[PDB]
Design a protein around this ligand. Structure first.
Ligand SMILES: Nc1ncnc2c1ncn2[C@@H]1O[C@H](COP(=O)(O)OP(=O)(O)OP(=O)(O)O)[C@@H](O)[C@H]1O
Lengths: 510, 466, 51, 160, 51, 71
């Protein structure tokens, strides 16, 4: 019937026919297979690390050349098989399609559309790991974001090329908070990536539920690696991203990525190393994380045209490879004593501490400010965002400074009382939800309290939340110009008139 | 190159790692340092023998990576490590971390294939002596004394005009000082390094120092390499008598660098696995840098903060590698003065009381009294209405306005940057003009008159301008 | 969203009818490429009798 | 079985032995030695022996001492070393000594075994199959070869 | 709801690739006969010719 | 270790029987960084400090039987 012709087609394909060959091995003897670690012999000197496609496809990449002595491995089920079996050798490690085609495409970590997608949108083949762009091949892109918290931008805006650590909290949302991130990103519909290992199928599933819930869901793609993803593979995904990530960065497009559970790659290298019976760094994993995250951590390349060959080389493409890096920092207690957290911590172009306290006592946004420190900062905050962004650490001081007064029971002063009015009341101002988008036309919303009398205006948290939302009404009433505003995104007092009279509408908006 | 004519060696026995499990021409072993230059696939391979171990089987290592080759091999033995074209010709011309023509061919002037191994002198050789130093920075070389041919711990945060003042160092170490002014760095931001080429045009004086850079992704040996060849360079400058003074980037890169080093050894390393002898490498280090006989072997001492370590066996060593203590004031940058940094915590060690004796024990030590004077005059007298404070405390606030304004002074940097000319300053006009004036003399000298104005003829003759 | 499912099911069912229908052609081309890759000689006498 | 200790052996075998031409001569002597350990009582009695002197003693002694004096005083050398524990390592490494010295060979694919000494590839090889004659390949003759090209073929049946 | 039937296509046609897979499975049996039927040690001498 | 020779095992073919090299000087066996496995110097005296070639009396404390390690 329908696909019968395909057989002919297959016959057409199989028309390529066949021959026997390689009269002399061309093969080894996999001397003693132990759990996919094969003492192995035959066909010895070669490309080190060659993935050697063994029975099944299994391409065993073993870079361990003892003089004369072989042993080898590849991710997979070695339990039933026996030792000595002649080494079936693919020449090396491989490359999965290299292209920008994927968009939001879905797959196994191999790119195997474990979605059942079957989908391959990428060109050709992409080997995994790569270095960063050179001077002015990477050059700072300041491209900002307000990520779903107004404070998201407000604390530290940024641009392409950047990697900032954010410490994270177990079972706090700091995966679900970490989830809560993508709001503006799916909204961004811009080039990004993300990676996960050892993954949980439920979290996978419901996650996907959010993915559709996320408007975009295609704005970026991720391959998937589950609880069986090899400690190898665990180490692999970070290598993997660059593969076609070029087809943005090399495309001169912003490449951007996200890696998480990097510990999985580490102790991956541990049960590797102890499995290697090889003395590793502490925690049974080798200290390569320096190099492993030297090679690994290098890549981030802000848009710069000494990527003059990026993409077309350069058919210009003489152009600005942008690669923005997305870190994931979390630990039980968030322990920096990890040599990983130590050196790794050093490499961070930003370091954000997340406080379990806020969302702990429940304040939806939980994070630890100023314990959160990122180097990129509100440089990317545009002229108004640049303008209005100042007072933060102030109440971080002031409010907390106001806090100090309690230390002596009944110590306060009306001035300090104003430092809990701004400090504590203006403290009452800020919030970000369990799921928070951020408008950045909300940038104005911010600049109000000082700019508007919103410092005083609707000072009641009842009226702050309430009456402020009623100012969101006043937008419903009057939000004509915000077109020209989010359009603008910059400090102009001409607006600021509309900021005062805005505050009048806020009287109208209560 | 040396020999390594003959391809030497033999196989790489167990192919693991840049250090050699390798068959050399088994009888063949060089000095462990003495290099072995193979072909690395396409590339010519090289390893200075990491180990000296027989059978041509010894660790021999490199900053690169080995995957893909056969355990079989042969590796030519570069009879010399360390010998690489070196001398003062490099100045301004871009050396790779290899010294390679880093730029479009940066062509740091090819010079003696010159052993990196240049090191400590005899007791007398580089100065059995003491050699003091100042370039006459407007408010600063006056502020602190210094010892020539050396390095001093630099603590300060931001907004240094370190590139500006470097232009003042161009205007000094190149200009107001002759002695060959060289510098080098490693581990930067790519186009921001290129932006230090932009700055290299800002000073434009980049010609004094070859451009040689690390770009921290450089492997640990790569990261840690360049120095001793740097001594094949001061093997020009100081050795060239045009006193080697070279600016020194990165300790954390170096501290942690030696950490990654002794780690890679797997050896009982220093504590917390650091380089055990990294400090002894500091003995070799200051052992290199001396106001010399040859020419003062001098270095700008500023540290990639080894995490700005607490008690910092680095700062422990960098203390006593600081002849002068250092601080930079965002507050004087908040004062924004042409003196924009922290004089607090910045002075030479022995300057005031002795060693200038009164010269600084009066002008500078008494000047430090004045630091108490606007310290509690500005500070204490600021606490409440200073009406209580004798106008001396308000002439310690004219030490602030008036005198501290005089501190604000044009800069040979600011010449080389904003045009604000600045100078090699004369602390006489401080020790007198600013000491007497700032203290009792012409206290009517306006802040502004003094502000952004050089020595007491610029501040006080700007008080003729008032 | 509910409705379309049943139809899609019918479609697959027809794919099953045409599937069994295709079984024939698979026997046919089955023997065909058998002789092709035989690539030595073809005796169609031997009846594999593939479905 | 380390054979590396026995590498230094077979080293000294072509070396001192072939130097003495004992590579053949103590191929004979050596042969008699592997005969000695080959004696299973001599294995059953192999090591209880603390004095390795007792070992070379009852060894050359027992067996009949066909070893050279290079192999008798060497019998002190390896016996004393106790590395004598592994006989065949440098025996096949000495087979590799003289033989590797003499190496020319072949391997039959899709065939019953060949091993026709070919100093060069195709030299005695194409000369053998051409020379076949044999041409049968009997062991691996057909199912192996036809399943070789047809092996690649089923590899195309990967299309299913 | 539409995307559902879309998957009924990816899966419908996918199964078409399945019965494909089994199809030249049974074909591969027919080729086992193609070694059975009409094989020649003459052709083996053609491999001998491939020497 | 011992097998390393193969040349003095080539000797030892006889020279396990053949013998008698005892001298204050047998070879430095293994040179890395002033630590050399070393030969001869049979009975040598206390940590016997052995005036080294172009170098100080070299000391080896407790007799390393096969090749004395040196300082
Ligand atoms: N901004 C937020 N405010 C309040 N709750 C949040 C926020 N973000 C996530 N959560 C909550 O966290 C819960 C999920 O916890 P989750 O396991 O994600 O904690 P975790 O912090 O992610 O732990 P880890 O980061 O180690 O995974 C969800 O119920 C979600 O409501």
């Amino acid at each position: 019937q329908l696909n019968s012709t395909e057989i002919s087609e297959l016959i057409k394909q199989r028309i390529a026919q066949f021959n026997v060959v390689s009269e002399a091995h061309n093969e080894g003897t996999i001397v003693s297979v132990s759990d996919g670690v094969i003492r192995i012999h035959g066909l010895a000197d070669a490309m080190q690390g060659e993935m050697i496609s063994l029975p099944g496809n299994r391409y065993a990449i073993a870079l361990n050349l003892e003089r004369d002595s072989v042993g080898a491995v590849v991710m997979g089920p070695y339990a039933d098989l026996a030792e000595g079996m002649k080494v079936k050798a693919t020449g090396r490690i491989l490359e999965v399609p290299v292209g920008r085609g994927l968009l939001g495409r879905v797959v196994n970590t191999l790119g195997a559309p474990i979605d059942g997608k079957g989908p391959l949108d990428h060109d050709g083949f992409s080997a995994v790991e790569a270095i960063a762009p050179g001077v002015i091949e990477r050059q700072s892109v300041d491209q900002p974001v307000q990520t779903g918290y107004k404070a998201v931008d407000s604390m530290i805006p940024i641009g392409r090329g950047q990697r900032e650590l954010i410490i994270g909290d177990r079972q706090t949302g700091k995966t679900a908070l970490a989830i809560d991130a993508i709001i503006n990103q799916r909204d961004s519909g811009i080039k990004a990536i993300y990676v996960a290992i050892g993954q949980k199928a439920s979290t996978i599933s419901n996650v996907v539920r959010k993915l559709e819930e996320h408007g975009a869901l295609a704005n970026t793609i991720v391959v998937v690696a589950t609880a069986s993803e090899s400690a190898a593979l665990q180490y692999l995904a970070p290598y993997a991203g660059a593969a076609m990530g070029e087809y943005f960065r090399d495309r001169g497009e912003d490449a951007l990525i996200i890696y998480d559970d990097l510990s999985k790659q580490a102790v991956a290298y541990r049960q590797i190393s102890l499995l290697l019976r090889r003395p590793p760094g502490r925690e049974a994993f080798p200290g390569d994380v320096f190099y492993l995250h030297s090679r690994l951590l290098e890549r981030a390349a802000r848009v710069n045209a000494e990527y003059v060959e990026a993409f077309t080389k350069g058919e210009v493409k003489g152009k600005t490879g942008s690669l923005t890096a997305l870190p994931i920092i979390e630990t039980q207690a968030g322990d920096v004593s990890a040599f990983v957290p130590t050196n790794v911590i050093s490499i961070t172009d930003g370091q954000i501490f997340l406080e379990t306290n806020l969302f702990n006592a429940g304040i939806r946004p939980a994070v630890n400010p100023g314990i959160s420190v990122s180097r990129v900062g509100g440089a990317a905050q545009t002229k108004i965002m640049k303008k209005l962004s100042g007072g933060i650490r102030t109440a971080l001081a002031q409010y907390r400074e106001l806090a100090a007064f309690s230390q002596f029971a009944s110590d306060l002063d009306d001035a300090t009382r104003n430092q809990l009015d701004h400090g504590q009341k203006v403290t009452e101002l800020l919030k970000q939800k369990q799921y928070a988008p951020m408008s950045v036309a909300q940038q104005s919303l911010v600049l109000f309290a000082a700019e508007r009398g919103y410092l005083a205006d609707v000072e009641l948290s009842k009226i702050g939340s309430f009456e402020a939302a009623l100012l969101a009404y006043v937008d419903r009433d009057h939000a004509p110009l915000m077109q020209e505003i989010n359009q603008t995104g910059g400090y102009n007092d001409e607006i600021e008139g509309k900021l005062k009279g805005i505050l009048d509408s806020f009287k109208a908006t209560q | 190159h040396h020999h390594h004519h003959g391809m030497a060696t033999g196989k790489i026995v167990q192919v693991i790692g840049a250090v050699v499990d390798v068959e050399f021409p088994q009888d063949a072993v060089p000095r462990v340092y003495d290099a072995l230059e193979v072909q690395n696939g396409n590339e010519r391979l090289v390893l200075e023998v990491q180990q000296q171990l027989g059978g041509g089987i010894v660790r021999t290592i490199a900053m690169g990576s080995s995957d893909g080759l056969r355990r079989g091999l042969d590796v030519k033995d570069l009879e010399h490590p360390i010998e690489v074209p070196v001398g003062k010709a490099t100045l301004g011309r871009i050396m790779n971390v290899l010294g390679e023509p880093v730029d479009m061919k940066g062509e740091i002037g090819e010079e003696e294939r010159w052993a990196i191994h240049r090191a400590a002198p005899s007791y007398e050789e580089l100065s059995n002596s003491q050699e003091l130093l100042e370039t006459g920075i407007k408010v600063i070389d006056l502020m602190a004394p210094f010892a020539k041919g050396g390095k001093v711990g630099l603590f300060g945060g931001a907004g240094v005009g370190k590139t500006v003042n470097m232009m003042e160092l161009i205007r000094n170490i190149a200009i107001e000082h002759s002695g060959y002014s060289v510098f080098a760095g490693v581990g930067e931001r790519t186009r921001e390094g290129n932006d230090f080429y932009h700055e290299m045009t800002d000073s434009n004086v980049i010609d004094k120092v070859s451009l040689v850079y690390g770009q921290m992704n450089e492997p640990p040996g790569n990261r840690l390499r360049v120095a001793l060849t740097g001594l094949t360079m001061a093997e020009k400058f100081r050795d060239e008598g045009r006193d080697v003074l070279l600016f020194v980037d990165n300790i954390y890169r170096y501290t942690l660098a030696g950490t990654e080093v002794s780690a890679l050894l797997g050896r009982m390393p220093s504590a917390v696995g650091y380089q055990p002898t990294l400090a002894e490498e500091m003995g070799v280090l200051q052992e290199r840098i001396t106001s010399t006989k040859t020419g003062s072997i001098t270095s700008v001492q500023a540290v990639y903060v080894p995490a700005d370590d607490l008690t910092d066996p680095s700062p422990a060593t960098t203390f006593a590698h600081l002849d002068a203590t250092v601080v930079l004031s965002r507050q004087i940058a908040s004062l924004g003065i042409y003196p924009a940094v922290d004089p607090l915590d910045s002075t030479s060690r022995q300057l005031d009381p002795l060693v200038v004796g009164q010269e600084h024990y009066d002008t500078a030590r008494g000047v430090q009294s004045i630091l108490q004077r606007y310290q509690e005059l500005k500070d204490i007298i600021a606490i409440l209405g200073m009406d209580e404070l004798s106008e001396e405390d308000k002439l310690v606030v004219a030490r602030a306005r008036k005198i501290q304004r005089f501190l604000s002074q044009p800069f040979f940097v600011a010449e080389v940057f904003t045009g604000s000319p600045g100078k090699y300053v004369s602390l006489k006009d401080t020790i007198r003009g600013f000491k007497g004036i700032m203290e009792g003399e012409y206290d009517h000298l306006p802040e502004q008159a003094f502000y952004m104005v050089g020595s007491i003829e610029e501040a006080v003759e700007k008080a003729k301008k008032l | 969203q509910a409705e379309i499912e049943a139809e899609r099911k019918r479609a697959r069912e027809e794919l099953r009818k045409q599937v069994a229908i295709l079984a024939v052609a698979g026997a046919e081309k089955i023997i065909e490429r058998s002789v092709d890759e035989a690539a030595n000689s073809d005796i169609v006498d031997k009846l594999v009798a593939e479905l | 079985e380390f054979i590396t200790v026995a590498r230094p052996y077979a080293k000294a075998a072509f070396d001192f032995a072939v130097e003495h031409q004992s590579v053949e001569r103590w191929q004979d002597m050596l042969a008699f030695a592997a005969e000695v350990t080959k004696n299973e009582q001599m294995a059953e009695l192999l090591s209880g022996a603390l004095a390795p002197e007792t070992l070379a003693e009852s060894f050359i002694a027992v067996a009949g001492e066909q070893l050279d004096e290079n192999g008798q005083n060497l019998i002190r050398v390896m016996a004393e070393n106790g590395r004598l524990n592994a006989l065949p390592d440098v025996l096949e490494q000495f087979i590799h000594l003289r033989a590797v010295s003499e190496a020319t060979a072949e391997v039959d694919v899709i065939s019953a075994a060949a091993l026709s000494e070919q100093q060069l590839a195709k030299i005695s090889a194409a000369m053998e199959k051409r020379l076949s004659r044999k041409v049968k390949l009997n062991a691996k003759i057909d199912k192996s070869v036809m399943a070789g090209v047809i092996i690649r073929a089923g590899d195309m049946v990967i299309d299913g």
